[PDB]
Coordinates of all heavy atoms in Angstrom, one line a residue:
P6 N 110.0 162.2 33.0 CA 111.0 162.7 32.1 C 112.5 162.3 32.5 O 112.7 162.1 33.6 CB 110.8 164.2 31.8 CG 109.8 164.6 32.6 CD 109.2 163.3 33.5
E7 N 113.4 162.0 31.4 CA 114.7 161.5 31.8 C 115.4 162.5 32.6 O 116.0 162.1 33.7 CB 115.4 161.2 30.6 CG 114.7 160.3 29.7 CD 114.6 159.0 30.3 OE1 115.6 158.2 30.1 OE2 113.6 158.4 31.0
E8 N 115.2 163.8 32.4 CA 115.9 164.9 33.2 C 115.4 164.8 34.7 O 116.0 165.2 35.7 CB 115.6 166.2 32.6 CG 116.4 167.4 33.3 CD 115.9 168.7 32.9 OE1 115.5 168.9 31.7 OE2 115.8 169.6 33.7
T9 N 114.2 164.5 34.9 CA 113.5 164.4 36.2 C 114.0 163.1 37.0 O 114.3 163.2 38.2 CB 111.9 164.5 36.1 OG1 111.8 165.7 35.3 CG2 111.3 164.4 37.3
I10 N 114.2 162.1 36.2 CA 114.7 161.0 37.0 C 116.1 161.2 37.3 O 116.4 160.8 38.4 CB 114.6 159.7 35.9 CG1 113.1 159.2 35.8 CG2 115.5 158.6 36.5 CD1 112.9 158.2 34.7
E11 N 116.9 162.1 36.6 CA 118.3 162.4 37.1 C 118.3 163.3 38.1 O 119.2 163.3 39.0 CB 119.0 163.0 35.9 CG 119.6 164.2 35.7 CD 119.7 164.8 34.3 OE1 119.6 164.1 33.3 OE2 119.9 166.0 34.2
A12 N 117.3 164.1 38.3 CA 117.1 165.2 39.5 C 116.8 164.3 40.7 O 117.2 164.7 41.8 CB 115.9 166.3 39.3
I13 N 116.0 163.2 40.5 CA 115.6 162.4 41.8 C 117.0 161.7 42.2 O 117.4 161.7 43.4 CB 114.7 161.3 41.4 CG1 113.4 162.0 41.1 CG2 114.5 160.3 42.5 CD1 112.2 161.3 40.5
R14 N 117.7 161.1 41.2 CA 118.8 160.3 41.8 C 119.8 161.2 42.4 O 120.4 160.9 43.4 CB 119.3 159.4 40.5 CG 120.1 160.3 39.6 CD 121.5 160.2 40.0 NE 122.5 159.1 39.4 CZ 123.1 158.3 40.4 NH1 123.1 158.4 41.7 NH2 123.9 157.3 40.1
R15 N 120.1 162.5 41.8 CA 121.0 163.4 42.4 C 120.6 164.0 43.8 O 121.4 164.3 44.7 CB 121.0 164.6 41.6 CG 121.5 165.9 42.1 CD 121.3 167.2 41.2 NE 120.7 168.3 42.1 CZ 121.3 169.4 42.4 NH1 122.5 169.7 41.8 NH2 120.8 170.4 43.1
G16 N 119.2 164.0 44.0 CA 118.5 164.5 45.2 C 118.6 163.4 46.3 O 118.0 163.9 47.4
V17 N 118.9 162.3 46.1 CA 118.8 161.2 47.1 C 120.3 160.6 47.3 O 121.1 160.6 46.3 CB 117.8 160.3 47.1 CG1 116.5 160.8 46.9 CG2 118.3 159.3 45.8
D18 N 120.6 160.3 48.6 CA 121.8 159.5 48.8 C 121.5 158.0 49.1 O 120.7 158.0 50.0 CB 122.6 160.2 50.0 CG 123.8 159.5 50.2 OD1 124.2 158.6 49.6 OD2 124.4 160.0 51.2
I19 N 121.9 157.2 48.4 CA 121.4 155.7 48.8 C 121.8 155.3 50.1 O 121.2 154.5 50.6 CB 122.0 154.7 47.5 CG1 121.2 153.5 47.6 CG2 123.6 154.7 47.8 CD1 121.8 152.4 46.6
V20 N 123.0 155.9 50.7 CA 123.4 155.6 52.1 C 122.2 155.9 53.0 O 121.7 155.3 53.9 CB 124.6 156.3 52.5 CG1 124.9 156.4 54.0 CG2 125.7 155.6 51.7
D21 N 121.8 157.1 52.8 CA 120.6 157.7 53.6 C 119.3 156.8 53.4 O 118.5 156.5 54.2 CB 120.4 159.2 53.2 CG 119.1 159.6 53.7 OD1 119.0 159.8 54.9 OD2 117.9 159.8 53.0
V22 N 119.1 156.5 52.0 CA 117.8 155.6 51.7 C 118.0 154.3 52.4 O 117.1 153.8 53.2 CB 117.7 155.4 50.2 CG1 116.6 154.5 49.9 CG2 117.6 156.7 49.3
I23 N 119.0 153.5 52.1 CA 119.2 152.2 52.9 C 119.3 152.2 54.4 O 118.9 151.3 54.9 CB 120.4 151.6 52.3 CG1 120.0 151.3 50.6 CG2 120.8 150.2 52.8 CD1 121.3 150.6 49.8
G24 N 119.9 153.3 55.0 CA 120.0 153.5 56.4 C 118.6 153.5 57.1 O 118.5 153.4 58.3
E25 N 117.5 153.7 56.3 CA 116.2 153.6 56.8 C 115.7 152.2 57.0 O 114.5 152.0 57.6 CB 115.2 154.5 56.0 CG 115.5 156.1 56.2 CD 114.5 157.0 55.5 OE1 113.4 156.6 55.1 OE2 114.8 158.1 55.7
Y26 N 116.5 151.2 56.5 CA 116.0 149.8 56.6 C 117.3 149.0 57.2 O 117.1 147.9 57.8 CB 115.9 149.3 55.1 CG 114.8 150.0 54.5 CD1 114.8 151.1 53.9 CD2 113.5 149.4 54.5 CE1 113.7 151.8 53.2 CE2 112.5 150.2 54.0 CZ 112.6 151.3 53.3 OH 111.4 152.0 52.5
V27 N 118.5 149.4 57.1 CA 119.6 148.7 57.4 C 120.6 149.5 58.4 O 120.8 150.7 58.1 CB 120.4 148.2 56.2 CG1 121.7 147.3 56.5 CG2 119.7 147.4 55.2
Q28 N 121.0 148.8 59.4 CA 122.1 149.6 60.3 C 123.3 149.4 59.6 O 124.0 148.6 59.5 CB 122.1 149.1 61.7 CG 123.2 149.7 62.5 CD 123.0 149.7 64.0 OE1 122.6 150.7 64.5 NE2 123.2 148.6 64.6
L29 N 123.7 150.7 59.2 CA 125.1 150.7 58.5 C 126.2 151.3 59.3 O 126.1 152.3 60.1 CB 125.0 151.7 57.2 CG 123.9 151.1 56.1 CD1 123.7 152.2 55.2 CD2 124.6 149.8 55.5
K30 N 127.4 150.8 59.0 CA 128.6 151.3 59.7 C 129.8 151.5 58.7 O 130.2 150.5 57.9 CB 129.3 150.6 60.8 CG 129.4 149.1 61.0 CD 129.2 148.7 62.5 CE 128.0 149.0 63.2 NZ 127.0 147.8 63.3
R31 N 130.3 152.6 58.6 CA 131.3 152.9 57.8 C 132.7 152.2 57.9 O 133.1 152.1 59.0 CB 131.7 154.5 58.0 CG 132.6 154.9 56.8 CD 131.8 155.8 55.7 NE 132.6 156.2 54.6 CZ 132.2 157.1 53.8 NH1 131.2 157.8 53.8 NH2 133.0 157.5 52.7
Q32 N 133.2 151.6 56.9 CA 134.5 151.0 57.0 C 135.2 151.6 55.7 O 135.0 151.2 54.6 CB 134.4 149.4 56.9 CG 135.6 148.6 56.9 CD 135.6 147.7 55.9 OE1 136.3 147.8 54.8 NE2 134.9 146.4 56.0
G33 N 136.1 152.5 56.0 CA 136.9 153.3 54.9 C 135.9 154.0 54.1 O 135.2 154.8 54.5
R34 N 135.9 153.5 52.8 CA 135.0 154.3 52.0 C 133.6 153.8 51.6 O 132.9 154.3 50.8 CB 135.7 154.6 50.6 CG 136.7 153.5 50.1 CD 136.6 153.5 48.6 NE 138.0 153.7 48.0 CZ 138.3 153.3 46.9 NH1 137.5 152.6 46.1 NH2 139.6 153.4 46.3
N35 N 133.2 152.7 52.3 CA 132.0 152.0 52.1 C 131.2 151.8 53.4 O 131.8 152.1 54.5 CB 132.3 150.6 51.4 CG 132.8 150.7 50.1 OD1 132.3 151.6 49.4 ND2 134.0 150.1 49.6
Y36 N 129.9 151.5 53.4 CA 129.2 151.2 54.6 C 128.7 149.8 54.4 O 128.6 149.2 53.4 CB 127.9 152.1 54.6 CG 128.2 153.6 54.8 CD1 128.5 154.4 53.9 CD2 128.1 154.0 56.2 CE1 128.8 155.7 54.3 CE2 128.2 155.3 56.6 CZ 128.5 156.4 55.6 OH 128.8 157.4 55.8

């Protein structure tokens, strides 16, 4: 359901998701 898809997206942080595959380093407001 559309509301469930929005609960999923709110419930994850893409920095956290991508950090499981890519070493990220912050530079100002981006990684």
Side-chain angles (χ1 to χ4, degrees):
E7 309 285 279
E8 187 193 323
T9 304
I10 286 165
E11 121 207 350
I13 293 163
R14 83 86 85 240
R15 164 194 129 110
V17 301
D18 176 359
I19 204 188
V20 163
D21 169 72
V22 179
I23 296 179
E25 289 194 1
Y26 293 87
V27 182
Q28 176 155 255
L29 295 169
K30 34 216 61 101
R31 196 99 184 198
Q32 178 234 97
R34 25 150 127 153
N35 293 312
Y36 286 83

